[PDB]
């Protein structure tokens, strides 16, 4: 008959030469790739390995990926046989409330983000430092003890759902001062955590640490020095392990998809991490997304039998790049707008492949660069400046000034203007000052933490408020000849403490001039 | 269930090897594993047209036999329509008078589908361009396949098998388009052969274009062996080696011949012509005076040749009692032909429709011929045998015998009449003696039907010296395929048949008889066991006579209201009626000589009503002098049946017909001179002609009887009032 | 020898080419669709998918759905193969008491199932505000803690029954303050909760939170800030999860239907919610009724083998629309009286399918619009206004006047008339004023919490009661020259609290007159 | 022992159909399945004494061979002794020198006993 080495349901010559699934009169048909038909329909040329039951070493087979007999929550770019399906869970903290262990309490709203430094995941919470001394409000001695409380949400960014189990999360202050350990209550909640969703999702109540219902869980407490350092840095750090529980699999006799107890995630993740090539990308809305594409490991005979994966085809099958008229690009955004950061060993390998091909521009030879397994590639955006965790905290002044070109409704109540959703992220505040014709400048919010004057409106734009720190009064324009400068600051320039000299004033803060208009009918 | 070490054994069966033969032995065995899938027939034909199979290494433009190719021919498009170069590609085929197959050898032909697929594509391109273009193929059969592909609902076959030029062609495919674009048809046939051979893509070619799958499957089963033998027919030495083997095998029966056997064979060849002095001296009486004064060119019972023979007999020396002497002297001048007697009787050589000792001499000579034909064909010097025959269409039918060939050019076949021919020509019964050929000889001008008989292991035959063979009597033939060929720019008909015993064919005809009886008792409301339709069929065009009965009876049903049908068929069931749809001669179905008075008073025409036993005959091949088709013949005879039933509803102890009454003879002399010439002979034929034309398919022929004979219209519509 | 890929029991050519189920001489008889015979009898043309054991991915097969071999509790519009059968359960709160941990407040609440702009089922409890300050009436200081106590009834609206296990409902105050967690008593009740039924049913006692005979229930308590927020909002919210117990199956050996321990609702709901299109509708009795219809998903090769589903056929098989004379309608109510609401993805998809067909009006092209999986459509009645929850909370002035316009009695004692059961869901009461011709208005019950004069009557026609809050004495006009004006208040205009100035007057209530007569003999 | 999907196969063998022949072919085959149980000998004797087997449709008094029956002979008692009428009943047999068997055709002869 027809040889089938791996018993996955697809013969060998189809798996080395290209196969695709066609439907004619409502019946699934598995065909050899015949290119004069199958480009007109829009079907896709799959390739896989003849001697692996799953090519990317994930729990779903080759046949069950190409035909749709798979768990329905799996993301659509994980349907390809060469892209691995595995969950990636980090923890999203929304607000924190600090209190004294018996007003004297603090309630702030935090903004967390997922990090990647220079396999395990984590997240970094940046507590908002503006208005609404922490020891003065709380009334703490040296013999004090503090109580910490917050609201968290588990978020999935991977490509596979997690059934009934949540990970075990450690809470880290500074570098390695563990304040607490968060576990999932009752150990089995009958929930689901789909890819790109939350738990509990955005229209329910968040999980509270030590909630109003239960009491017997461990109270989270600090001493005085931990509270000093937390007032210094405004920054906690979550760390999450990788216990994800059992796997949902398919059954052929009735089409049911059920949680099979004889199959676990914690014994199949260290195969995906050993036989794939990881590409991280943040061109979507400046949040880091991680994918893994199966690639050829040359020194292993069952790993050289995978298909050959150029970097162009890896970007196409992973992130939805496409080339409309030759230039490979991502929803208009061309790839000359994107960097390439490598780690050490794959930088050595890419440099040897470029020296072999006698080319020096990597952006022109992407269809010839081969990927091997165990790589690490980071593709960032050129416009912004990134800190130690590959988070956009800075920009160049050109795009920051060009974000504020398009004006809508200017007055003396404030500014309402159309601003881009990518450039809102890097900006931390605004400074607003009044300049005479003679050369005196009077900043009207003379503190480091009265800069939160912009506010988003649910139609999709932001409205700057001038009244907000001027005793809810409109802008006093005595002589409308002289003007008011209102302009911005970036997160890499923002101060998060009083100074070592105690300076609360707005001096020393770097700044980008975005706005100066006359004061009459133009503004 | 399979445990895990059994999976270790299966995966080591696929993985581990023990012997490695180097490179070149595996290179050699990969090429033979490539060519093992092709049928051996196209390899043998590529051997016979002068072709060389060169399995080479390295470059294929570096071989000697492809050295003089130009720069232009080194741009090759593969199976998918995409570009290639011959120093990059691996198989090329050289066109012309000395073809060459060049294949680069590698170990990639054993598991891959692509390279083997392109090799079978080049072999199919050789088959479409070189071998089949020597017998003028592909042709109308494959054009019907192409028009079935491009007139489908779904557009996947057009994408799979056609180029861009064949897509944008707005009309359908005519044979002009096969003339001036034959290379495109060759490409399409090559691509279909490529997808059929390589066994991974066979289900794909079945799914995306099923009609090409059916064509190529039936092709590679039968037509490839038939085409190899017809290609050997074009060569002379194959013909004479087949001649040599047949002469050596049939030598001893020709050695066991006597003088009487050779005389019987030569009298079976030609008819024994009558001499004229033996005719004239036979009379010598008043009979000579009746032959001497006679209207030669007036009586319509004898043919043209027969009236000319009587004109020849006047110089060797009237619709009244002299023409009975013409009826008696019709059978007196017919030649002693065994083939005409076997052709007219249909197996009953005891039918007393001719003279006495002539019947006995016929029967004894037929028993002598059948006793001499005793040798079987089963032998070891040969494989399958392909024996031919050129035959006239008029020996099967006279309805299609005139309009088969187109009138603008007489070397075409009219396709509408060809599809009417093709529709129901499923089998054949050979009662008479098929004098068949060993090899091909070109046909006479009246014979476009080109038979090709495949024999049985039990075929009984005898040998002739002049290049012919004779088959015995009562042989069954089941038709395989009927197609239009072209040979020397003259379009023909090729027909195959396969020898079966007679019991299977008569079993089929018995089943069809029981089915038509059940259906037409169910449609008329009659007793369960009544036999109202019967078939005495023994000739070559049997299947279409079996199938055409349905159209004949439905057209008779639609042309008359149901009440007259029910009443007159009830009368016929009471009077032991039949509707004999037969293709043998009218005096030999034994519903007609069991009531006539004289042998020479027998009738042979289109339809016939036997008045005593109330039967309606019909004849298969013969066509009426008046009629346009057989359905008007059946209405024409139902006219005489209505005449008889109206003759019974005047007095149940008196005359048989209503037209023999003198109350219709006046209307026959008044309005019997405005209609067609067939009914003008006497009153009954005008009666049947009026009843035929009043119920026509189109209403204007019904309106001609309205305008020409209105009182006869009112009288016939009073003759339906007898209910 | 008969082709059957999905093992459901019906051959393939029957499922792609049409089939129907006929009963002939008291015997079931499944057969191909032949139109000239089966159109006359009034049978239904079924189509399904040849490679799925159940087309809508619910645990009843195609054969068991079409032939009747099913648990008989499954609703009649889920016997079609294309409509998914699954439970939808929310919690119905009847009445509440607030006690202090008489001097306890007792109100009657009217809850409703909501759908905001997939997972979980939420309902919004509206507390009555009429005559029986809450802090005075309970006698509460600052350091109090309140106690809550109410009566609930679980109510199913889906298409499939629940056996033995009730869900676990959270009780949310405001936006995301969890008050308590309601769980199932005794962990098994041995009941059945059918489609469209209440547990406990309408003629028993409701389930009481913190019951009399139970004592081990945790007290549902509040602090002072939550109590003021509950008084100032008059609203709760009930968030119910989806643990639904096991499934009743059909035993082919002896006609028995029993609860199967090896099959579960928690493993077949996230396939129904991933392969089907949802159509929410409120034309019957102004409640949000959710259904799901099986539809194609084009990028999945086992999902393009479902039948092609238009929108006309989707409405016909799910909701019982019919076209008697070419106009598609709902029991006389025509579909030009219903609007279509979409979410964003299916809005873009419908705009592309309209721009394809060169059509502009959706209501004339409904048999040409093709559905695909993961669509979301909301069909609402045109005559009413809606809030964020998509509850009918208002109407225009014209339809209220023209619905009240057929008046039966109008005198100095009240007003009796016939009122429709759709208009009785948007009115919160009636008040009557006397307007002078120089411009002096005279509201007779000038408080926000004396509106409940209307009472449902055994006749079905409500009597607007002028007596009850006028010190039980009717209205005497001094001059019939100036007019008498009575007016209903609609639920989007009804005020539930005093203002910041402590006003209890009638100004601020935007009026909709149902009465316009000069006061004299006319009315 | 029989498991449950085997009962699915038995019940689909009784239920599901693939080919439907219209009406009249099943009408014809039901009548021959009716007459298949009778010994062939009495059919051959009814053939030999001059009898006709008429499988008809519709009314049985509307057939030609039962036209001249009186008013009195249209009151028929069936097998159980109870009353019937010939425009309500479905089989009558004509007595005398030329007997006639008239059967109304339907699809109820295949499964019914009555
Ligand atoms: Ca495989
Ligand atoms: Ca594989
Ligand atoms: Ca099926
Ligand atoms: Ca099915
Ligand atoms: Zn004539």
Brief description of this entry?
The structure is cut from a larger assembly and holds one copy of chain A (about 525 residues), two copies of chain B and one copy of chain C (about 525 residues). Chain B has about 725 residues and is of the alpha+beta class.
Percentage of residues in strands of chain C:
25-35%
Strand content of chain B: 5-15%
Shape of chain B: elongated
Work out the radius of gyration of chain B. 33 Å
Tally of individual helices of chain C: 9
What's the total count of β strands of chain B? 17
Assign the structural class of chain C, choosing from mainly alpha, mainly beta, alpha/beta, alpha+beta, or little secondary structure. Answer: alpha+beta
* Total strands of chain C: 32
Q: Ligands bound here? A: calcium ion, zinc ion
Helix/strand-derived category of chain B reads alpha+beta
Question: How would you describe this structure to a colleague?
Answer:
This is part of a larger assembly, with one copy of chain A (523 residues), two copies of chain B and one copy of chain C (523 residues). Chain A has 523 residues and is α+β, with helices and mostly antiparallel strands. In chain A, 13% of the residues lie in helices and 29% in strands. Chain A contains ten helices and 33 strands. In chain A, the strands form ten sheets. In chain A, strands 3, 4, 7, 12, 13 and 14 form a six-stranded antiparallel beta sheet that branches. A five-stranded antiparallel beta sheet of chain A has the order 5-6-15-9-10. In chain A, a hairpin with a 5-residue loop joins strand 28 and strand 29 (441-443). The termini of chain A are far apart. Chain B is α+β, with helices and mostly antiparallel strands and 723 residues long. Chain B has four domains: 1-220, no CATH class; 235-269 and 335-500, no CATH class; 275-332, no CATH class; 502-722, no CATH class. Helix content of chain B is 45%, strand content 10%. Chain B has a five-stranded mixed beta sheet, with helices on one face. A three-stranded mixed beta sheet of chain B has the order 1-5-4, with helices on one face. In chain B, strands 8-11-10 form a three-stranded antiparallel beta sheet. In chain B, strand 4 (91-94) and strand 5 form a beta hairpin. The radius of gyration of chain B is 33 Å and the shape is elongated. Chain C is α+β, with helices and mostly antiparallel strands. Chain C is 13% helix and 30% strand. Chain C has nine helices and 32 strands. In chain C, the strands form ten sheets. In chain C, strands 3, 4, 7, 12, 13 and 14 form a six-stranded antiparallel beta sheet that branches. In chain C, strands 5-6-15-9-10 form a five-stranded antiparallel beta sheet. A four-stranded mixed beta sheet of chain C has the order 19-18-23-22. The relative contact order of chain C is 0.10. Chains in contact: A-B, A-C, B-D, C-D. Chain A binds chain C through residues 21-23, 25-28, 66-69, 72-73, 76, 79, 151, 161, 190, 192, 194, 201, 203-206, 208, 211-213, 248, 253-259, and chain C through 5-7, 12, 16, 49-54, 57, 59, 61, 116, 119-120, 122, 170, 172, 176-181, 239, 241-243, 263-264, 266-268, 270-271, 274-275, 299-307. The complex binds calcium ion (4 copies) and zinc ion. One calcium ion binds next to helix 1 of chain A. Chain A: The record marks 5, 14, 63, 252 as: Alpha-clamp. Chain A: It is a multi-pass membrane protein. Chain A: It is found in: Host cell membrane; Host endosome membrane. Chain A: It comes from Bacillus anthracis. Chain A: Residues 86-275 are annotated as: Domain 2, membrane insertion and heptamerization.
């Amino acid at each position: 008959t027809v040889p089938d080495r791996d018993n996955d349901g697809i013969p060998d010559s189809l798996e080395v030469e290209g196969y695709t699934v066609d439907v004619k009169n409502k019946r699934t048909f598995l065909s050899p790739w015949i290119s004069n038909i199958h480009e007109k329909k829009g079907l896709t040329k799959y390739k896989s390995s003849p001697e692996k039951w799953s090519t990317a070493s994930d729990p779903y087979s080759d046949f069950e990926k190409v035909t749709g007999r798979i768990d329905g929550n799996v993301s659509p770019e994980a349907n390809h046989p060469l892209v691995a399906a595995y969950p990636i869970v980090h923890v999203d903290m929304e607000n924190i409330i600090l209190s004294k262990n018996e007003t004297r309490t603090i309630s702030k709203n935090t903004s967390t983000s997922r990090t990647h430094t220079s396999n395990s995941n984590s997240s970094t919470v940046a507590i908002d430092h503006s208005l609404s001394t922490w020891a003065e409000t709380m009334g703490l001695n040296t013999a004090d003890t503090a109580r910490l409380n917050a609201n968290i949400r588990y978020v999935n960014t991977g490509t596979a759902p997690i059934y009934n189990v949540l990970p075990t999360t450690s809470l880290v202050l500074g570098k390695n001062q563990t304040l607490a350990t968060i576990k999932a209550k009752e150990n089995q909640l009958s929930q689901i955590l789909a890819p790109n969703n939350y738990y509990p999702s955005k229209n329910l109540a968040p999980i509270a640490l030590n909630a109003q219902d239960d009491f017997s869980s461990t109270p989270i407490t600090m001493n005085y020095n931990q509270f000093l350092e937390l007032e210094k840095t405004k920054q906690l750090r979550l760390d999450t392990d990788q216990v994800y529980g059992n796997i949902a699999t398919y059954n052929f006799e009735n089409g049911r998809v059920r949680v099979d107890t004889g199959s676990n995630w914690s014994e199949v993740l260290p195969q995906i991490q050993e036989t794939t090539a990881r590409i991280i990308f943040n061109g979507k809305d400046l949040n880091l997304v991680e994918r893994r594409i199966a690639a050829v490991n040359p020194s292993d005979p069952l790993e050289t039998t995978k298909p050959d994966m150029t970097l162009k085809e890896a970007l196409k099958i992973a992130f939805g790049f496409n080339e409309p008229n030759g230039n490979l690009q991502y929803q208009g955004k061309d790839i000359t707008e994107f960097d390439f950061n490598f780690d050490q060993q794959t930088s050595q390998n890419i440099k040897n492949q470029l020296a072999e091909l006698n080319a020096t521009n990597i952006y022109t030879v992407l269809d010839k660069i081969k990927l091997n397994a165990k790589m690490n590639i980071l593709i960032r955006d050129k416009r912004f400046h990134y800190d130690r965790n590959n988070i956009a905290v800075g920009a160049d002044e050109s795009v920051v000034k060009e974000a504020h070109r398009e004006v809508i409704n200017s007055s003396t109540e404030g500014l309402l203007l159309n601003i881009d959703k990518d450039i809102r992220k890097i900006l931390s505040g605004y400074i607003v000052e009044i300049e005479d014709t003679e050369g005196l400048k009077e900043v009207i919010n003379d503190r480091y933490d009265m800069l939160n004057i912009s506010s988003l409106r649910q139609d999709g734009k932001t409205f700057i408020d001038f009244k907000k720190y001027n005793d809810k009064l409109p802008l006093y324009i005595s002589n409308p000849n002289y003007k008011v400068n209102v302009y911005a600051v970036t997160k890499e320039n923002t101060i998060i403490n009083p100074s070592e000299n105690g300076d609360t004033s707005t001096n020393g803060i770097k700044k980008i001039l975005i706005f100066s208009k006359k004061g009459y009918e133009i503004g | 269930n399979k445990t895990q070490e059994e999976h270790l054994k299966e995966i080591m069966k696929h993985i581990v090897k023990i012997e490695v033969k180097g490179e070149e032995a595996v290179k050699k065995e990969a090429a033979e594993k490539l060519l093992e899938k092709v049928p051996s027939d196209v390899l043998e034909m590529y051997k016979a047209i002068g072709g060389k199979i060169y399995i080479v290494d390295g470059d294929i433009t570096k071989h000697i036999s492809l050295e003089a190719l130009s720069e232009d021919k080194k741009k090759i498009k593969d199976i998918y329509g995409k570009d290639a170069l011959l120093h990059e590609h691996y198989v090329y085929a050289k066109e012309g008078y000395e073809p060459v197959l060049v294949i680069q050898s590698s170990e990639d032909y054993v598991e891959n589908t692509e390279k083997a697929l392109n090799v079978y594509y080049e072999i199919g391109k050789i088959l479409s361009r070189d071998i089949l273009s020597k017998i003028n193929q592909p042709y109308q059969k494959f054009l019907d396949v192409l028009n079935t592909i491009k007139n489908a609902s779904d557009s996947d076959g057009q994408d799979l098998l056609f180029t861009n030029q064949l897509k944008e062609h707005p009309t359908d495919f005519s044979v002009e388009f096969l003339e001036q674009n034959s290379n495109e048809v060759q490409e399409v046939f090559a691509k279909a052969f490529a997808y059929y051979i390589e066994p991974q893509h066979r289900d794909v070619l079945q799914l995306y274009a099923p009609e090409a799958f059916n064509y190529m499957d039936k092709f590679n089963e039968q037509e490839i062996n038939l085409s190899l033998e017809e290609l050997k027919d074009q060569r002379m030495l194959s013909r004479y080696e087949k001649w040599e083997k047949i002469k050596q095998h049939y030598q001893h029966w020709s050695d066991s011949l006597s003088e009487e056997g050779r005389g019987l064979l030569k009298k079976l060849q030609i008819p024994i012509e009558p001499k004229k002095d033996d005719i004239i001296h036979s009379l010598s009486q008043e009979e000579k005076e009746l032959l001497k004064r006679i209207q030669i060119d007036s009586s319509d019972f004898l043919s043209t040749e027969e009236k000319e023979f009587l004109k020849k007999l006047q110089i060797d020396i009237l619709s009244e009692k002299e023409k009975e002497f013409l009826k008696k002297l019709k059978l007196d001048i017919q030649p002693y032909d065994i083939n005409q007697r076997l052709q007219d009787t249909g197996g009953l050589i005891d039918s007393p429709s001719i003279n006495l000792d002539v019947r006995k001499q016929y029967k004894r000579d037929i028993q002598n011929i059948d006793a001499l034909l005793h040798q079987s064909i089963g032998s070891t010097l040969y494989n399958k045998i392909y024996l031919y025959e050129n035959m006239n269409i008029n020996n099967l039918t006279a309805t299609l015998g005139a309009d088969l060939v187109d009138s603008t050019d007489n070397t075409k076949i009219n396709r509408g009449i060809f599809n009417e021919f093709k529709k129901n020509f499923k089998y054949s019964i050979s009662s008479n003696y098929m004098i068949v050929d060993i090899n091909e000889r070109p046909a006479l001008d009246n014979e476009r039907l080109k038979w090709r008989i495949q024999l049985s292991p039990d075929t009984r035959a005898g040998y002739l010296e002049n290049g012919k063979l004779i088959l015995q009597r009562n042989i069954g033939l089941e038709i395989k395929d009927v197609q239009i060929i072209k040979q020397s720019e003259k379009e023909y008909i090729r027909i195959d048949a396969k020898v079966v015993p007679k019991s299977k064919i008569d079993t089929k005809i018995q089943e069809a008889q029981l089915n038509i009886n059940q259906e037409w008792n169910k449609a008329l409301g009659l007793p369960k066991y009544t036999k109202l339709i019967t078939f005495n069929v023994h000739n070559r065009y049997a299947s279409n006579i079996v199938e055409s009965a349905y159209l004949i009876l439905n057209e008779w049903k639609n042309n008359i209201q149901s009440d007259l049908i029910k009443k007159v068929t009830n009368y016929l069931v009471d009077g032991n009626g039949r509707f004999v749809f037969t293709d043998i001669t009218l005096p030999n179905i034994a519903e007609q000589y069991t009531h006539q008075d004289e042998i020479y008073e027998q009738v042979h025409s289109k339809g016939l009503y036997v008045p005593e036993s109330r039967s309606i005959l019909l004849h298969g091949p013969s066509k009426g002098v008046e009629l346009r088709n057989d359905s008007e013949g059946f209405i024409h005879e139902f006219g005489h049946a209505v005449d008889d039933y109206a003759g019974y509803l005047l007095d149940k102890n008196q005359s048989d017909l209503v037209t023999n009454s003198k109350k219709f003879i006046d209307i026959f002399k008044e309005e019997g001179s405005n209609l067609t010439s067939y009914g003008r002979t006497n009153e009954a034929e005008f009666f049947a002609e009026a009843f035929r034309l009043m119920h026509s398919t189109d209403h204007a022929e019904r309106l001609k009887v309205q305008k020409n004979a209105p009182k006869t219209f009112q009288f016939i519509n009073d003759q339906i009032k007898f209910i």
